[PDB]
């Protein structure tokens, strides 16, 4: 599958945490139905937990649009341009709350196999080994077998 | 169309110019051959004496045909006719650059037309100053026997009574074969014609008539050193120390016009 699947290296969006941490998620859209068994858990979530999340994270734009809808859906947009959609069809309040928290923590970075879990811009401090390292010199820089 | 087209030498030659071209080619060939007639007068390379183990150069000849020959003993022996045509040294190879054991010399004969030949072949021959030859063959020659390129070779190099080895391509028999080089060993030479450069060789020679063959001294152990009493480098008509007879005969050979042989 790895041969048939893509991979990447460790990277950061714009060195987010160097100066101050910025939340990647920027906009949340919620679709609900007044009368739908699938939206029952979402219906209760709006009553109780939606306000708490908004107060906890006031920097994410939240859109709640109750409308006649077959399947409730949640759309999350990230600063880097990543957009993710999650179906809320017949999911409980607790499931919804956990999912939103996971979405906020997650970044727009692609989720694929990472070849190296470590990223460094200055891997060497004392200099990278080269063949001439540890090779003893000779007087006058005489090459081997040189009669001179 | 801006595309390649097929061309031949006669495509753009007019009838009047075509006749002139034919005459010019004959004149050019004659002039080139005459210029190379005198090797000894062309800064010849140093001449060395014969010593045991020396190997002389060979010649290329055309298979004219066969005829019957009678000896003074009354025996009849069939013989084959070989003609040496425009035999000239072309390229000498140094001993080190070809083979440490012995040096080699390239000899070509039977001049051919220049109309349907590659430019590269013509360019090499232009430098040598000779018309192109049908076949190139390589002869193993010792350093002492090396001859400068462009030296004309004549049928008089060999002499009657000398055994020789001839190699030629066998006749091809088609899908069933043939068309492979083969050598016949131990063929005696009965007579040589100086005027027409014709050598009479005992036995049969592989190949069809009018086919070029390679002639070289016999390599059998018995005839290890036969060149001691023969022209060591080669026979030079340029020297003309003593004009040779037009026809050379072996002692046993019964010459025509001789008295009828009586077994007394």
């Amino acid at each position: 599958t790895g041969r048939g699947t893509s991979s990447r290296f460790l990277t950061s969006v714009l060195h987010n945490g160097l100066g101050r941490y910025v939340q990647q998620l920027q906009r949340l859209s919620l679709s609900l139905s007044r009368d739908a068994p699938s939206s029952r858990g979402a219906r209760e979530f709006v009553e109780r937990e939606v306000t708490d999340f908004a107060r906890r994270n006031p920097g994410v734009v939240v859109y709640v649009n109750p409308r006649p809808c077959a399947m409730p859906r949640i759309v999350a947009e990230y600063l880097n341009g990543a957009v993710r959609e999650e179906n809320v069809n017949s999911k409980s309040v607790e499931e919804i709350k956990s999912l939103v928290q996971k979405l906020a923590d997650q970044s727009g970075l692609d989720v694929i196999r990472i070849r190296k879990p470590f990223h460094t811009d200055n891997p060497s401090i004392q200099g990278q080994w080269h063949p001439f390292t540890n090779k003893r010199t000779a007087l006058h820089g005489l090459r081997p077998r040189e009669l001179r | 169309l801006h595309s390649k087209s097929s061309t031949w030498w006669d495509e753009h030659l007019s009838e009047e110019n075509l006749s002139f071209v034919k005459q010019l080619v004959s004149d050019e060939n004659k002039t080139q051959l005459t210029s190379k007639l005198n090797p000894l007068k062309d800064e010849p390379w140093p001449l060395h004496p014969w010593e045991p183990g020396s190997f002389r150069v060979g010649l290329i000849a055309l298979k004219l045909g066969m005829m019957p020959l009678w000896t003074k003993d009354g025996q009849k022996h069939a013989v084959t006719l070989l003609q040496v045509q425009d035999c000239h040294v072309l390229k000498y190879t140094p001993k080190e650059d070809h083979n440490g054991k012995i040096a080699a010399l390239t000899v070509g004969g039977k001049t051919v037309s220049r109309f349907y030949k590659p430019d590269s072949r013509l360019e090499f021959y232009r430098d040598l100053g000779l018309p192109p030859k049908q076949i190139h063959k390589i002869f193993h020659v010792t350093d002492n026997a090396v001859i400068k390129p462009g030296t004309p070779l004549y049928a008089a190099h060999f002499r009657p009574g000398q055994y020789v080895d001839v190699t030629a391509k066998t006749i091809g028999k088609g899908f069933q074969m043939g068309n492979q080089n083969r050598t016949v060993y131990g063929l005696k030479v009965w007579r040589v014609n100086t005027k027409h450069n014709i050598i009479y060789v005992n036995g049969s020679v592989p190949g069809h008539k009018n086919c070029l063959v390679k002639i070289k001294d016999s390599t059998l152990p018995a005839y290890k050193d036969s060149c001691k009493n023969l022209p060591f480098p080669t026979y030079f008509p340029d020297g003309d120390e003593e004009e040779l007879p037009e026809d050379l005969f072996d002692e046993s050979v019964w010459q025509p016009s001789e008295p009828s042989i009586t077994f007394a």
Partner: protein, 149 residues
């Protein structure tokens, strides 16, 4: 395996080849220009040239009369050979027949076609090839060489 062969295998047998060649020769004499396959035309070209020699030999020749009768099925042609073809070619020493290549037949077999005709005939001239003129640049350059020589 066609090495050294001097005869083509035509018809259903050697006799058929002679008869087929006989028919071709008779037709050529009557018309003086015939189109046929290149292989057959080449084979019959030699026969036609020799026939003209027989006509040149003379009418009184018994062998020529027998030869003419056998080769020419139509007997009206026998006077023609001795009185038309033979007089015409008296000056010529040979090359009585002209054979040229014709575009291959578009008959789904793509046979090689050639036309054989008797020279000096009254028929319209065939479209023969014309050699390049000496006025061409290359020929003119050779002309300058000729003048120098």
């Amino acid at each position: 395996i066609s090495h050294g062969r001097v005869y083509r295998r035509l018809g259903l047998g050697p006799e058929s080849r002679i008869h087929l060649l006989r028919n071709l020769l008779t037709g050529l004499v009557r018309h003086e220009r015939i189109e046929a396959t290149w292989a057959r035309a080449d084979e019959m070209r030699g026969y036609a040239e020799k026939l003209i020699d027989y006509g040149k030999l003379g009418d009184t020749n018994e062998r020529a009369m027998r030869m003419a009768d056998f080769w020419l099925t139509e007997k009206d042609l026998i006077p023609k050979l001795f009185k038309v073809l033979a007089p015409r070619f008296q000056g010529q020493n040979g090359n009585y027949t002209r054979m040229l290549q014709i575009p291959n037949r578009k008959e789904q077999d793509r046979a090689k076609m050639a036309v054989i005709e008797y020279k000096g005939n009254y028929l319209p001239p065939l479209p023969l090839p014309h050699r390049d003129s000496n006025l061409t640049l290359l020929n003119q350059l050779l002309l300058g060489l000729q003048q120098d020589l």
